[PDB]
Paper text:
We attempted to crystallize all THB11 length variants, however, despite extended screenings for suitable crystallization conditions, only THB11-NC, which is reduced to the heme-binding domain (HBD), and from which the Strep-tag had been removed, formed crystals. THB11-NC crystallized in space group P21 21 21, with one molecule in the crystallographic asymmetric unit. The tertiary structure recapitulates the typical 2/2Hb fold, but unusual features are observed, such as a kink in helix E, a tilted heme plane and a tunnel system possibly shielded by Met residues. Only one heme orientation isomer could be fitted into the electron density map of THB11-NC, and the porphyrin ring is rotated by 180° along the α–γ axis compared to those of THB1, LI637 and Synechocystis or M. tuberculosis GlbN. Normal-coordinate structural decomposition analysis indicates that the heme group of THB11-NC features an overall out of plane displacement of 0.49 Å, and the heme distortions are dominated by doming and ruffling. The imidazole ring of THB11-NC HisF8(81) (note that residues are indicated in the Perutz nomenclature, followed by their numbers in the structure in brackets) is in a moderately staggered position, and its plane is tilted towards the heme group. In the distal site of THB11-NC, the CN– ligand lies in moderate H-bond distance to the hydroxyl group of TyrB10(32) (2.8 Å), whereas position E7 is occupied by Leu53, and the distance of the ligand to the amide group of GlnE11(57) is 3.9 Å (N atom) or 4.9 Å (O atom). LysE10(56) points away from the heme cofactor, being located at the E helix side that is averted from the distal niche. In the THB11-NC structure, MetH11(123) as well as the adjacent LeuH12(124) were modeled in two conformations, and, together with MetG9(99), MetH11(123) restricts the site at which the ST exits in M. tuberculosis GlbN. According to the calibration of the SEC column, these represented approximately tri- and heptamers in case of THB11 and THB11-N, and mono- and trimers in case of THB11-C, whereas the elution volume of the single THB11-NC peak corresponded to a monomer.
Author numbering: 12 to 137
Amino acid sequence: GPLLQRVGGLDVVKKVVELFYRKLYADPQLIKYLHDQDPMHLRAKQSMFVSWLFGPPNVPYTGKSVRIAHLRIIKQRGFSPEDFDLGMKYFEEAMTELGAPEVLRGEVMRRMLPYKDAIFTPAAGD
Ligand code: HEM
Ligand SMILES: [C-]#N
């Protein structure tokens, strides 16, 4: 049934996100963007998105614009689509390492994929 149960419940989601952030901060290309970001604060800010991500299907995300959220590191530090790809690799690795099957991982990653274009497509108002 629901994605949250299928992946193994809220304890698994928590550990996926924590492993995701461990991988992020250990990466020498992404640390440029994170060394001055409190990892606990960042996870807190990302929580609404993660709650939507493992929530009911089809519901559109209505939280803060992800381009706006990342626009400082884009303009000031060159955060690029290739850095976002690495982030998505690490989120997928975290799900794999905690035992989530590929069919579940593909479902989750397909929900996340549109947010690459969201972050990096210029919009009036930047
Ligand atoms: C790959 C390396 C990544 C870096 C360096 C990074 C960096 C950041 C930073 C610095 C913020 C802080 C924005 C703020 O506090 O105003 C943020 C917020 C956020 N990022 Fe990322 N990010 C990465 C990948 C991702 C990925 C893969 C996603 C998946 C969708 C994502 C989704 C979000 C969300 C939802 C927020 C919170 C927006 C809000 O405040 O509601 N980020 N990110
Ligand atoms: C992005 N955390």
